Amino acid sequence: VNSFSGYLKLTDNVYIKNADIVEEAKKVKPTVVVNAANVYLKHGGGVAGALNKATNNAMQVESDDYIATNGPLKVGGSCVLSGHNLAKHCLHVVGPNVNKGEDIQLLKSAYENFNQHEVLLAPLLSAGIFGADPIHSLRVCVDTVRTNVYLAVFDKNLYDKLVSSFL
Numbered sequence: 001v002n003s004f005s006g007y008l009k010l011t012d013n014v015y016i017k018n019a020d021i022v023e024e025a026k027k028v029k030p031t032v033v034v035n036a037a038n039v040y041l042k043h044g045g046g047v048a049g050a051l052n053k054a055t056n057n058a059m060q061v062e063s064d065d066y067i068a069t070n071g072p073l074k075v076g077g078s079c080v081l082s083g084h085n086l087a088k089h090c091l092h093v094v095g096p097n098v099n100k101g102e103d104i105q106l107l108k109s110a111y112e113n114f115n116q117h118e119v120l121l122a123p124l125l126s127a128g129i130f131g132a133d134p135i136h137s138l139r140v141c142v143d144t145v146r147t148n149v150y151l152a153v154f155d156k157n158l159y160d161k162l163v164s165s166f167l
């Protein structure tokens, strides 16, 4: 039993909800919140901009130190940093950005990072401003993640489309 509330069960381990991941993180304080990161951990917009703003820019400060020490992430890669006031940990995961020409086949590699964590609150990777089809992203998530994932979908219209079209 966990503290997540109001989710639709899609499969044994994948759940989905129409919600703002920031407010969901602030309420649940999950062990792991996933950020829709880029390789430079520059959290300007989309999910990343929203998570960072909610931390009063502490996420960005921590991230800049991480990059100064380690260099950029790989597309498809991840790193574990603090969750600040939102979660115990933030798993920054780099889905491919279609608006940069990155290979959508890397989306599966991105979701594989979730399997290192027993339970996660997450957005759909590569959706939104990363330019991929959210229906496809959900399919890859379901077919790749084996741990317990709670997906927050900000757009109410999009959520209903994902559910109604889910196979």
Ligand SMILES: O=C1CC[C@@H](c2cccs2)N1Nc1ncnc2[nH]c3ccccc3c12
Pocket (backbone or CB within 6 Å): 019, 020, 021, 022, 046, 047, 050, 123, 124, 127, 128, 129, 130, 134, 152, 153, 154, 155, 158
């Ligand atoms: O609903 C989806 C599906 C793909 C993804 C993206 C859409 C555009 C770029 S990325 N998204 N957005 C969000 N996901 C989680 N929490 C969110 N809180 C919000 C508060 C205001 C506005 C949007 C969101 C939002």
